[PDB]
Design a protein around this ligand. Structure first.
Ligand SMILES: Nc1ncnc2c1ncn2[C@@H]1O[C@H](COP(=O)(O)OP(=O)(O)O)[C@@H](O)[C@H]1O
Ligand SMILES: [Mg+2]
Lengths: 55, 77, 371, 55
């Protein structure tokens, strides 16, 4: 037939598109999270040196 | 007062797997098997039987023609 | 032993043993006495055909449903239906099986008390329990929160639940359901020439509604399209020939759900009573209810309703919340599947109304702790 | 027919689940990156305050 092929292929394409988009988003989320952790760690030391400067 | 349900232990949303994943594959495979066996049993046998009945019908037609002609030959007076 | 999960419903009685996937016997709940005289002798003509037998002899019967809107209006017929269900469709005597009936929310007390009195005196069951039809539909989805819209054939009710704690002040019960849609379809078919009047022909109109009608995503655009082209006109063959062609009656029949002003009802559609039911809830559980909106019941099987309802609620709701509508493919039997799951639980095994308890407190036991 | 409809329904369940996961991951990325950039702005303001204290 004809309809089954096109509908099935389009739906599988939709699933694959959503999956890859989710993977890209999660990768960027993990990278941003680690960079945020770095920012926290540096900010604490910045606060410590600021406190010493103020003393 | 509204009823008070005694406290139990577990579970919920954990039987969705055991009632979904089962038929997610078993049902599909079993229905494919049913369709395959039904098509095999039905279509080819029906076409072959119809051809057989058609041949018998043609033979009946020949017999009818012969008998009709011989009776018309004799009875024609 | 095993429990009997019966589910009276209104339009289709669904029953079966606890612990399975689908009800064992599903058949319309109609009891029809013959109306003509009858001349053949010894034909073995009975005085009342119930269940699926009266959907085959409906040409000479006067079918009448014993349940109008959730409530039961004709107790003798309902007793007959139950007797048929137990003895002929399941063939299990009720003396050896617990039963789990289901009841719509906000129903009259006398109905429930009479139901339990019948089950304990006539059929003489060991123990029976009555459960609200929406909690079961929430069981079947495997959730524990969510607001369930159970649009049956008798009555549409909308019970919100959070973390297992039902909110009794936010139940919005509306009496528009599948039967009113059947009557409205039968009333608008007369605009083309087809007149269905007999109580038997209501079944034919119901079949037309099931097989052809669908819910439009946008009503005005569909009304404009059906009035210009002819790509919508689908034909259907009556039980005797004379095919009929349904035009824009296709999406006008189920549109009554979202605009109950069509059949003269004042209230707002099923798209706005859900939002009102949510807004009565507390301010901190509205996000979860928005994200876990559940559909159930037969009448929510129209092709294209899970998109129209989502569009409407997204229009009403704040723009930030995510609106998700759970529409499982097994919608029709969702209540019964949930009933089977609930009856199969070990924690629930001590909530049944045991017969000795009924003997000590009378039928009014159902309103007590054993709810 | 019969099996074809069920197979389509399976292909649609995969569609819904994949699409929902993709959307949720995208929302997670948006939230996480906003968190990181606000932390970076806080770090910048701390640097400026340290500069004023040094002056
Ligand atoms: N496939 C379908 N499409 C549209 N409407 C349906 C479909 N199946 C059932 N209905 C409607 O739903 C009703 C059955 O609802 P049901 O869930 O059995 O009610 P109850 O809650 O009493 O069991 C029927 O009267 C019919 O009008
Ligand atoms: Mg129901």
């Amino acid at each position: 037939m004809d309809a089954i092929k096109k509908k099935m292929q389009m739906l599988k394409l939709d699933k694959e598109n959503a999956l890859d988009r989710a993977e890209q988003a999660e990768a960027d989320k993990k990278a941003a999270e680690d960079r945020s952790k770095q920012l926290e760690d540096e900010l604490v030391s910045l606060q410590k040196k600021l406190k010493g400067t103020e003393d | 007062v509204p009823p008070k349900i005694p406290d139990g232990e577990r579970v919920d949303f954990d039987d969705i797997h055991r009632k979904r994943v089962e038929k997610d594959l078993n049902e599909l495979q079993t229905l494919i098997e049913a369709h395959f066996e039904n098509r095999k049993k039905e279509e080819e046998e029906l076409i072959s039987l119809k051809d057989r009945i058609e041949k018998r019908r043609a033979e009946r037609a020949e017999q009818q023609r012969i008998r009709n002609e011989r009776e018309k030959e004799r009875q024609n007076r | 032993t095993t429990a009997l999960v019966c589910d009276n419903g209104s339009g289709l009685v669904k029953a079966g043993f606890a612990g399975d996937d689908a009800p064992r016997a599903v058949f319309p709940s109609i009891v029809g006495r013959p109306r003509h005289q009858g001349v053949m002798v010894g034909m073995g003509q009975k005085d009342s055909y119930v269940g699926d037998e009266a959907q085959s002899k409906r040409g000479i019967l006067t079918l009448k449903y014993p349940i109008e809107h959730g409530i039961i209006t004709n107790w003798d017929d309902m007793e007959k239906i139950w007797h048929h269900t137990f003895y002929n469709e399941l063939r299990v005597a009720p003396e050896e099986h617990p039963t789990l009936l289901t009841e719509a929310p906000l129903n009259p007390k006398a109905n429930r008390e009479k139901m339990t009195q019948i089950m304990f005196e006539t059929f003489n069951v060991p123990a029976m329990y009555v459960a609200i039809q929406a909690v079961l539909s929430l069981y079947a989805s495997g959730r524990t929160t969510g607001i369930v819209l159970d649009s049956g054939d008798g009555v549409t009710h909308n019970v919100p639940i959070y973390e297992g704690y039902a909110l009794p002040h936010a139940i919005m019960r509306l009496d528009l359901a599948g039967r009113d849609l059947t009557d409205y379809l039968m009333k608008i078919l007369t605009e083309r020439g087809y007149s269905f009047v007999t109580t038997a022909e209501r079944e034919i109109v119901r079949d037309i509604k099931e097989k052809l009608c669908y819910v439009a995503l946008d009503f005005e655009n569909e009304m404009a399209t059906a009035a210009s082209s002819s790509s919508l006109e689908k034909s259907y063959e009556l039980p005797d020939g004379q095919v009929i062609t349904i035009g824009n009656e296709r999406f006008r029949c189920p549109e009554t759900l979202f605009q109950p002003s069509f059949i003269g009802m004042e209230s707002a559609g099923i798209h706005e009573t859900t939002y009102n039911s949510i807004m009565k809830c507390d301010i901190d559980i509205r996000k979860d209810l928005y994200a876990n909106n559940v559909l159930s019941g037969g009448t929510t099987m129209y092709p294209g309703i899970a998109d129209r309802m989502q569009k409407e609620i997204t229009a009403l709701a704040p723009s930030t919340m995510k609106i998700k509508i759970i529409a499982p493919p097994e919608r029709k039997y969702s209540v019964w599947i949930g009933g089977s799951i609930l009856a199969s639980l070990s924690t629930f095994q001590q909530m049944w109304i045991s017969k000795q308890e009924y003997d000590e407190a009378g039928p009014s036991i159902v309103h007590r702790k054993c709810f």
